[PDB]
């Protein structure tokens, strides 16, 4: 479809060129045979008139005719048709100057294909009806094609320059043609005087000659002059339309006068010029193609596609529960957030995973039941009513910042927020994150878990220490430094530091006077010598120092007796001292997968113990005083070096769990029936140890 | 036309110039035929045979019109220069030669056929939707097959065209000839264009016929031929310049080497090879027309695109639904998938989450993608003649989930080096020879790293046992070595089998029992199959081993059982089949705990009564023996279920078989049972599937009993 | 078109030479019709009825224009050689005979029908996907399988139908022989009679009763132009004849009635392709002289092993 890009002046000049070709061909075929001159010598040698006798043969007459055709006839009168032919062929070749160069031709084909495809697209009519399924996907594909066309054509302006060069060439050629044709049109005359010197042949010197085809050539010259003048007026109008309006800028304000959409950008250079071309064809294509340009139309189409694909019944199918017993909607890799999601009002938690370029409307005010929000690796935007409502209502937040900007800056305008899950990663310039130190606006924050490679605790935590209570940090091989920021914790109760590479327990933990629990997970504690100040943590009941490297346990454990939970699983402890079990309030003691050589008898002091795990130890001797402690509910002694299960084991009335898996035992005693809370599941052992109960004991044990 | 794509801008420019040249030649020839003449006048005053040039009156020549015509013809033939006479024919001939040189490329049948094939496949690729998808990178079956067929056509076309360089050579020759012709045309035409004059003097010596010798003439189409030549020369110059540019375009770059470095850097497929000779030449010409065609044809050349298309087609050929239809179960009642003679593993396999037994059979050098981690229940893995290549997340999920690995091979390189890095491996059958140079148990030296193995089946034609297996045997509980008739050197190196419970020496050909067999207290299953025991004499030392419960001594050359076999009591599945026992003794029935007794293919003289000492016995197979009668004591046992008694010499079954209740399966094709006792129909658990019996003796029974059995079968 | 496949380089070269000679024949015929005359001036001085031809004044002949026209016509008809008058018509006739010899292969209904059948199923075998499948060495469509089986049976039937008689090869050999003999006769007579195309022609026609003169001297205007045309025609005929002798040497080099598929059976998997004979062998030699890919793609249908692979794959 190349004729669409041709306005009225282009086809008018083309048909003028065909007329010029006809005139030139007619003039040429006249000049080939009809063009001849007739010459008679001058001063030749009831009234009866007598003819003058020139005494010349026919051959001499032809010779005179030739001499006068060559040396007396003006060159214009002989070569006018060939000049017309050459000039109109140059006009025809330059008529498609802006059509033939392959880059411009590709641009023309691309633009006309795009304009025709969106012309056939019903999304234009749908959008025009809105302002005043499969086809939605086709419209989206055509829109991204339009954006690619914008990135491919608008930045250049070669087509306009080629058009202006072609127009200027046509105008200057028309000026030349009018000038020389008007100058030499008087030379085409009938009667000419020929003064060749052929006196030595014919006998005469002065001749009067007649160009037989001079009237016809004059009429043809005037007709060609008229056609050239019309062609030049057409080209002058083309140049005037080129110059008096700036065609490097196409304005869609005339569309804006009746169409409400105002985000439409104004295209420039090649796009502007060739849209002006399509306007010259018919303005309907331009005012219709306007709707395919703006971006808010694409956003509206995306929202419509999301609403169509996600019926509320599909959301009922998607409804599930989460880790905090809330109604969760898992939305995975979505284009956006549908309003159908907000139509659900029973919803208690929102899960948005990598749904980026998303703006939260006021419609979330529909669902009042929200308590948790999962904004995972998604850059989210906001609206004023959404800020107000999520300030009033939202309390639990769980975001993942794969990218720093994928953390949105508006989490911190809230106040009702209580739980925060800051999973992700961080760079070297930790203190520059002003996003962290805006939680001063948060008043209700109580849970903070930051799985990130955080080396320096921010001053954010220092500010929010008054109301914060729980820390969970997974550095994953990153050293944590600058522990004064954890010193100025005051009201914190829980601290779970994982892989922080803390060589020693800082004075930060002892500056805490109300810490309920401490975790020093994956932290290389080679020695524990700073426990002297641990007495200041009177609230400390949990010391989960597991997978650690504590080589020996000193007397400093006597500083705190309020300790209840004690996890030293996989520790480097060799021999337990006499000084652990003085703290009788301990109930929950773990030494799982350690390598203790043996258990000394001072374990008898721990009566209020309810859990004693030493599994996978090298312990060959269990003295009977741990069997004397009857309050010991759980007692895990698995995979040690022990020999025989104690026959007087039924004395432990409150022995809920006895993990003695993989121990080298011989025969189970019959007094497991006296044990009230020990099962085959509880007494996990190898099966050849399970097969050892007496038959009546099997009858009493299968019935428990 | 169809070959416009091959023609660059210079070729079409030369074509248009040649068309204009042909128009000029036609015009000049028309003028030469019609109105090209000479009209000559005699020189009246002549001195030394030259025009003397010595109111006014006309000069009288006294010449007729025919004498004038004769003078004109003779002075046109003899004294007009040949260039003025034959210039239109010369430009005609030159233009025809130029056109022939230009069209000889498309005229010559070999190059025309090559160009037609190239243009056809390029046009088919340009409209191929798979090309659009590859540029974009779920397809139709016919679309994928068309893409594969076009790929194969591209391969065979490349093999067809890269061998010869005739097309480029022909184009070079045509350009050279055009340049040389331009040079000659310019030289001769510029040399001879000055001879086209208007006034020519002719001295033809026709004084005998006319009366004059010298005449001065005038050529009408002289100064018109002087502009038609001068315009023609210009075109030739333009033609030559264009041709010269084409010649320059041959010399700066090598047309026989089209390097795809520019295309493969921009495109994702950075493995596009560089084409050569004629194919390179027409790809370069495609670039001169429009590079988009060559860019689109480039995706039908890379091998990565071929692999992607094969994977896309394989997802279509092997879908999740088809895999579920083919989904089967193994001997362990676990979900297995038998992929036999596959090119690879489709990702539809890996989209599963419930698969436990991934079986890979005869797949050439496959690469396992990480999505195996989605197969959450994956525990077994079967490698049969399959070189497996795996990555690290796969190794992670197999280190936390996979507890079985079944490797079958015929070569060392078929066995991958990753399989020794599993942290949950428990069951492991290596099938194929594991003894080689620097590789005898050093293929699999990472079996120390596997600390949870419990089953080790080795069909390896083995001659020795590694000590590391004995070290692993703290947790390993089953070792079955198949060697196809090769004796191992035990040398009492197996005593670390504390946890071994099933020592199964299949086709060991030992003929003796080493002390390590009856030193291992946890052994419960002992079958010395095909070991050619003429005598079994080592059962006495088994009483220190408290756990032996099943002596399946089958498929052996055992000639006789000593009566000391009566000392045992604790066996249940006493399978002494496929032997040469002369007779079963009463001592063997001192075993009270027997629940299963197989004595198939023996030389038993008869069946004694003490077979009825077996109350808990469930299946009994004394098949292929010489047995005539079943005693009533055998029928006091209420628990007989599977009585494979066929191909025997059984005379009759005594009516005390009515005491039997739990009979389930019996085989009686064979034997000598004259007629069916109705008690065989009395057995409730014995159904039509279990009562494999002759039909006539069944018909001898009353029809209503048969009807009752039928109604029990069908209701 | 459909017949361009069976036109080797010699055939297309002879066709282009033929249209070129047709063009020069048309040009010469137009020239003969329009501008072929001869200007005859009487010899005022005579000797034994021969042209003696022994301020100058032109010789007065006292002849009207009509007597001059009569002298022109009589000397043109009588004392101008028949070659210089009927050269373009002879060239046109020879060119028409050459074109008829070239195209009688396409016009005779038996040979034209055989050529059409061959071209048709060669195009169908090219369009057959099993050609690609066999040349590569999976899943078969029912319609594709039926088309492949029908094409195999058509190939077998046609091979049986045409291998019996070699009328096409015999006709092509006869056409080549006729063309080479025509070229020999043309070059002989044209070389002999080209020197009789002269400019100055002395005519003695005995019209003294009407004109008054006995002998005249004539100038043939289109004499050297006709001589140039004759030399051009001689060059074209020499080129045509050299091409025809090359074509005849192509016939006599090897038996075109016996085609051996040894190279293709060695390169391809199927090594049981029989050595076909006579008209099929000639027709395959022609397409081998155009493009060996046609034989490569068509040899798979002749072999029975490919049929064995066909029946196994169709069953699957
Ligand atoms: C492009 C710019 C356009 C320039 C405008 C016209 C200027 C051209 C000037 C030509 C010129 O002056 O040449 C002179 C010369 C004759 O002059 P004298 O012998 O001095 O005549 C004496 C007068 N009694 O005229 C010419 O040669 C005419 C020039 C060529 C015109 C025709 C060309 C024909 C070529 C096309 C062939 C078509 C065949 C199909
Ligand atoms: C001698 C000319 O001699 P005369 O004609 O006597 O002229 C003498 C010149 N003073 O020189 C030559 O022959 C020049 C050769 C010119 C070759 C022209 C070739 C024309 C070929 C005809 C092609 C016919 C195509 C028809 C369509
Ligand atoms: C080769 C085939 C030509 C054989 C020619 C052998 C000699 C012929 C011959 O001598 O006959 C004369 C005779 C010419 O007669 P005049 O000039 O009167 O000669 C009188 C003799 N003083 O020559 C011929 O026979 C002419 C031969 C040319 C035949 C061409 C016929 C044209 C056919 C139709 C044209 C189609 C156009 C459409």
Curated annotation (Swiss-Prot), chain A:
Sequence ranges on the Cytoplasmic membrane side: 241-704
Coiled coil: none
Listed SMART domains: LRR_TYP
Repeat positions for LRR: 310-321, 322-344, 347-367, 368-389, 391-414, 416-438, 442-464, 467-487, 489-512, 514-536, 538-560, 561-583, 585-606, 607-629, 631-652, 653-675, 677-700
Matches recorded under PROSITE patterns: LRR (PS51450)
Record-level GO cellular component terms: endoplasmic reticulum; endoplasmic reticulum membrane; monoatomic ion channel complex; plasma membrane
Induction of synthesis: Induced during the earliest stages of adipogenesis.
Location(s), subcellular: Cell membrane; Endoplasmic reticulum membrane
Pfam families in the cross-refs: LRR_1 (PF00560), LRR_8 (PF13855), Pannexin_like (PF12534)
Keyword Endoplasmic reticulum on entry: yes
Regions that span the bilayer: 8-33, 78-97, 164-185, 216-240
Cysteine pairings via disulfide bonds: 39-209, 68-194
Biological process, per Gene Ontology: aspartate transmembrane transport; cellular response to osmotic stress; cyclic-GMP-AMP transmembrane import across plasma membrane; fat cell differentiation; monoatomic anion transmembrane transport; protein hexamerization; taurine transmembrane transport
Chief location bin: membrane
Gene3D superfamilies registered for this protein in UniProt: Ribonuclease Inhibitor (3.80.10.10)
GO molecular function terms noted in the UniProt entry: volume-sensitive anion channel activity
Extracellular face of the membrane: 186-215
Keyword entries, A-Z: Cell membrane, Disulfide bond, Endoplasmic reticulum, Ion channel, Ion transport, Leucine-rich repeat, Membrane, Phosphoprotein, Repeat, Transmembrane, Transmembrane helix, Transport
Role summary: Non-essential component of the volume-regulated anion channel (VRAC, also named VSOAC channel), an anion channel required to maintain a constant cell volume in response to extracellular or intracellular osmotic changes. The VRAC channel conducts iodide better than chloride and can also conduct organic osmolytes like taurine. Plays a redundant role in the efflux of amino acids, such as aspartate and glutamate, in response to osmotic stress.
Entry note about domains: The volume-regulated anion channel (VRAC) channel forms a trimer of dimers, with symmetry mismatch between the pore-forming domain and the cytosolic LRR repeats, a topology similar to gap junction proteins.
Subunit structure: Heterohexamer; oligomerizes with other LRRC8 proteins (LRRC8A, LRRC8B, LRRC8D and/or LRRC8E) to form a heterohexamer. Homoheptamer; inactive, likely because it is not targeted to the plasma membrane in the absence of LRRC8A. In vivo, the subunit composition may depend primarily on expression levels, and heterooligomeric channels containing various proportions of the different LRRC8 proteins may coexist.
Assigned protein family: Belongs to the LRRC8 family.
UniProt-recorded name of the protein: Volume-regulated anion channel subunit LRRC8C
Source organism (scientific name): Mus musculus (Mouse)
Gene: Lrrc8c
Curated annotation (Swiss-Prot), chain B:
Subcellular location as annotated: Cell membrane; Lysosome membrane
Catalytic activity, reaction form: chloride(in) = chloride(out); iodide(out) = iodide(in); taurine(out) = taurine(in); L-aspartate(out) = L-aspartate(in)
SUPFAM superfamilies for this protein: L domain-like
Cysteine disulfide partners in this protein: 40-217, 43-51, 75-202
Domain of life: Eukaryota
PTM comment, free text: N-glycosylated.
GO term, biological process aspect, one: cell volume homeostasis
Locus of motif Di-leucine motif: 613-614
Control of this protein's activity: Inhibited by (4-[(2-butyl-6,7-dichloro-2-cyclopentyl-2,3-dihydro-1-oxo-1H-inden-5-yl)oxy]butanoic acid), which plugs the channel like a cork in a bottle by binding in the extracellular selectivity filter and sterically occluding ion conduction. Lipids may block conduction in closed heterohexameric channels.
GO cellular component annotations of the record: cell surface; lysosomal membrane; monoatomic ion channel complex; plasma membrane
Effect of a null allele: Increased prenatal and postnatal mortality, growth retardation, and multiple tissue abnormalities. B-cell development is slightly impaired, without affecting B-cell function. Mice however show a cell-autonomous early block in thymocyte development and impairs peripheral T-cell expansion and function. Conditional deletion in germ cells leads to abnormal sperm and male infertility: the cytoplasm of late spermatids appears swollen, preventing reduction of the cytoplasm during further development into spermatozoa.
Function field: Essential component of the volume-regulated anion channel (VRAC, also named VSOAC channel), an anion channel required to maintain a constant cell volume in response to extracellular or intracellular osmotic changes. The VRAC channel conducts iodide better than chloride and can also conduct organic osmolytes like taurine. Mediates efflux of amino acids, such as aspartate and glutamate, in response to osmotic stress.
Protein's name according to its UniProt entry: Volume-regulated anion channel subunit LRRC8A
UniProt source species: Mus musculus (Mouse)
């Amino acid at each position: 479809a190349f004729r669409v890009l041709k306005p009225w002046w282009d086809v008018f000049t083309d048909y003028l060129s065909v007329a010029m070709l006809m005139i030139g061909v007619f003039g040429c075929t006249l000049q080939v045979m009809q063009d001849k001159i007739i010459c008679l010598p001058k001063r030749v040698q009831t009234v009866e008139m007598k003819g003058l006798k020139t005494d010349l043969d026919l051959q001499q007459y032809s010779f005179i005719n030739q001499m006068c055709y060559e040396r007396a006839l003006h060159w214009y009168a002989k070569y006018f048709p060939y000049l017309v032919l050459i000039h109109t062929l140059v006009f025809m070749l330059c008529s498609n100057f802006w059509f033939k160069f392959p880059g411009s031709s590709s641009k023309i084909e691309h633009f006309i294909s795009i304009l025709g495809k969106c012309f056939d697209s019903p999304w234009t009519t749908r959008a025009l009806s809105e302002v005043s399924k499969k086809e939605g996907e086709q419209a989206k594909a055509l829109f991204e094609k339009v954006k690619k066309f914008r990135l491919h054509v608008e930045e250049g302006d070669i087509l306009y320059a080629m058009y202006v060069r072609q127009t200027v060439l046509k105008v200057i050629k028309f000026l030349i043609i009018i000038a020389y044709n008007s100058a030499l049109v008087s030379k085409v005359q009938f009667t000419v005087d020929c003064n060749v010197d052929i006196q030595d042949m014919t006998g005469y010197k002065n001749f009067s000659c007649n160009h037989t085809m001079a009237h016809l050539f004059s009429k043809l010259s005037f007709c060609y002059l008229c056609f050239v003048s019309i062609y030049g007026l057409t080209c002058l109008y083309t140049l005037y339309w080129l110059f008096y309006r700036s065609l490097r800028e196409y304005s869609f304000e005339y569309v804006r006068q009746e169409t409400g959409i105002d985000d439409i950008p104004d295209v420039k250079n090649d796009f502007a010029f060739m849209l002006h071309m399509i306007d010259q064809y018919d303005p309907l294509y331009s005012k219709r193609f306007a709707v395919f340009l703006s971006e808010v139309s694409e956003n509206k189409l995306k929202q419509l596609n999301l609403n169509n694909e996600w019926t509320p019944d599909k959301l009922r199918q998607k409804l599930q529960t989460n880790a905090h017993n809330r109604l969760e909607l898992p939305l995975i890799m979505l284009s956006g957030l549908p309003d159908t999601v907000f139509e659900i009002t029973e919803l208690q938690s929102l899960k948005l995973e990598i749904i980026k370029n998303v703006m939260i409307p006021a419609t979330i005010a529909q669902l009042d039941n929200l308590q948790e929000l999962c904004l995972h690796q998604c850059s989210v935007k906001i609206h004023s009513a959404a800020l107000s409502f999520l300030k009033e209502n939202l309390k639990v937040l769980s975001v993942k910042f794969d990218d720093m900007r994928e953390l949105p800056p508006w989490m911190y305008g809230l106040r009702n927020l209580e739980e925060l899950y800051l999973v992700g990663s961080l760079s070297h310039d930790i203190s520059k994150n002003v996003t962290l130190e805006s939680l001063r606006d948060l008043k209700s924050l109580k849970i903070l878990s930051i799985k990130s490679n955080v080396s320096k605790i921010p001053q954010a935590v220092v500010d929010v220490s008054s109301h914060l209570q729980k820390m969970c940090v997974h550095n994953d091989g990153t050293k944590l430094v600058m522990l004064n920021n954890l010193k100025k914790m005051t009201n914190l109760t829980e601290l779970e530091l994982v892989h922080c590479d803390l060589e020693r327990i800082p004075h930060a933990v002892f500056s805490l006077l109300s810490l309920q629990e401490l975790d020093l997970k994956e932290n290389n504690l080679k020695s524990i010598e700073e426990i002297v100040s641990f007495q200041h943590l009177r609230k400390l009941t949990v010391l989960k120092l597991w997978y650690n490297s504590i080589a020996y346990i000193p007397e400093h454990i006597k500083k705190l007796t309020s300790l209840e939970r004690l996890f030293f699983s996989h520790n480097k402890v060799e021999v337990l001292p006499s000084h652990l079990f003085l703290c009788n309030k301990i109930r929950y003691l773990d030494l799982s997968y350690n390598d203790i050589r043996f258990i000394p008898p001072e374990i008898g002091v721990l009566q209020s113990l309810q859990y004693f795990s030493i599994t996978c130890n090298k312990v060959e001797s269990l003295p009977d005083e741990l069997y004397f402690c009857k309050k010991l509910k759980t007692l895990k002694i698995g995979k040690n070096s022990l020999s025989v299960l104690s026959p007087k084991i039924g004395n432990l009335l409150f022995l809920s769990y006895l993990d003695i898996k993989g121990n080298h035992f011989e025969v189970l005693p019959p007094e497991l029936g006296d044990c009230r809370a020990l099962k085959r599941a509880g007494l996990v052992v190898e099966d050849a140890l399970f097969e050892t109960l007496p038959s009546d004991v099997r009858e009493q044990m299968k019935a428990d | 036309p169809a070959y416009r794509i091959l023609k660059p801008w210079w070729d079409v420019f030369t074509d248009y110039i040649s068309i204009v040249m042909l128009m000029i030649a036609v015009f000049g020839g028309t003028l030469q035929v019609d109105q090209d003449k000479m009209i000559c006048l005699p020189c009246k005053w002549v001195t030394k045979d030259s025009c003397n040039d010595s109111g006014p009156t006309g000069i009288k020549y006294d010449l007729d019109r025919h004498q004038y015509n004769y003078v004109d013809a003779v002075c046109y033939e003899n004294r007009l220069h040949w260039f003025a006479k034959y210039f239109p024919y010369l430009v005609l001939l030159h233009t025809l030669i130029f056109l022939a040189c230009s069209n000889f490329w498309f005229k010559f049948p070999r190059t025309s056929s090559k160009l037609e094939h190239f243009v056809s496949i390029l046009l088919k690729c340009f409209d191929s939707p798979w090309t659009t998808r590859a540029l974009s990178e779920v397809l139709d079956k016919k679309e994928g097959e068309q893409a594969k067929a076009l790929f194969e056509k591209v391969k065979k076309f490349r093999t067809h065209v890269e061998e010869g360089d005739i097309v480029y050579r022909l184009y070079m020759r045509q350009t050279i000839i055009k340049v040389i012709k331009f040079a000659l045309i310019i030289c001769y035409t510029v040399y001879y264009v000055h001879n086209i004059k208007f006034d020519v003097d002719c001295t033809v010596d026709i004084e005998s016929l006319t009366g004059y010798r010298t005449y001065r003439c005038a050529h009408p189409l002289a100064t018109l031929f002087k502009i038609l030549a001068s315009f023609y020369i210009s075109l030739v110059i333009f033609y030559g310049l264009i041709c010269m540019y084409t010649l320059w375009w041959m010399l700066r770059r090598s047309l026989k080497k089209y390097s795809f470095e520019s295309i493969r850097e921009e495109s994702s497929y950075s493995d596009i090879p560089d084409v050569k000779n004629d194919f390179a030449f027409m790809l370069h010409l495609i670039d001169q027309y429009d590079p988009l065609y060559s860019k689109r044809f480039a995706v039908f050349l890379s091998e990565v695109s071929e692999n992607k298309l094969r994977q896309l087609n394989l997802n279509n050929e092997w879908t999740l639904d088809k895999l579920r239809q083919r989904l089967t179960k193994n001997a362990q009642d676990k979900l297995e998938l038998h992929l036999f003679m596959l090119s690879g593993i489709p990702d539809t396999v890996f989209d599963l989450v419930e698969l436990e037994v991934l079986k890979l059979e005869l797949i050439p050098d496959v690469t396992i993608p990480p999505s195996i981690a989605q197969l959450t229940g994956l525990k077994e893995l079967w490698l049969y003649h399959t070189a497996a290549k795996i990555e690290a997340p796969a190794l992670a999920f197999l280190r936390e989930n996979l507890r079985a690995l079944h490797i079958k091979f015929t070569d060392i390189k078929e066995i991958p080096l990753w399989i020794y890095s599993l942290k949950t491996l428990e069951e492991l059958h290596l099938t194929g020879n594991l003894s080689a140079e620097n590789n005898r148990y050093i293929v699999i030296d990472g079996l120390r790293e596997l600390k949870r193995l419990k089953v080790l089946r080795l069909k390896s034609n083995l001659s020795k046992l590694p000590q590391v297996v004995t070290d692993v045997g703290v947790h390993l509980q089953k070792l079955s070595i198949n060697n196809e008739g090769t004796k191992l050197i035990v040398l009492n190196s197996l005593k670390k089998m504390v946890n071994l419970t099933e020592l199964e020496l299949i086709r060991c050909d030992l003929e003796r029992i080493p002390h390590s067999i009856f030193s291992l207290h946890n052994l419960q299953e002992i079958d010395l199959k095909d070991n050619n025991l003429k005598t079994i004499e080592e059962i006495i030392s088994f009483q220190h081993l408290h756990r032996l419960t099943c002596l399946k001594l089958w498929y052996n050359h055992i000639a006789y059982i000593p009566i000391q076999i009566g000392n045992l009591t604790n066996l249940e599945r006493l399978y002494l089949n496929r032997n040469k026992i002369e007779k079963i003794p009463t001592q063997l029935f001192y075993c009270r705990k027997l629940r299963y007794l197989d004595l198939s293919h023996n030389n038993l003289t008869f069946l004694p009564a003490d077979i009825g000492l077996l109350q808990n016995l469930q299946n009994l197979a004394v098949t292929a023996n010489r047995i005539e009668a079943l005693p009533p004591e055998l029928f006091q046992c209420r628990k007989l279920r599977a009585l494979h008694l066929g191909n025997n010499v059984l005379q009759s079954l005594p009516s005390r078989v009515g005491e039997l209740t739990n009979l389930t399966q019996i085989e009686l094709r064979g034997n000598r049972l004259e007629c069916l006792p109705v008690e065989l129909g009395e057995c409730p658990l014995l159904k039509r599937s279990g009562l494999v019996v002759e039909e006539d003796l069944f018909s001898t029974l009353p029809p209503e009993v048969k009807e009752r059995l039928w109604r029990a079968d069908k209701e």
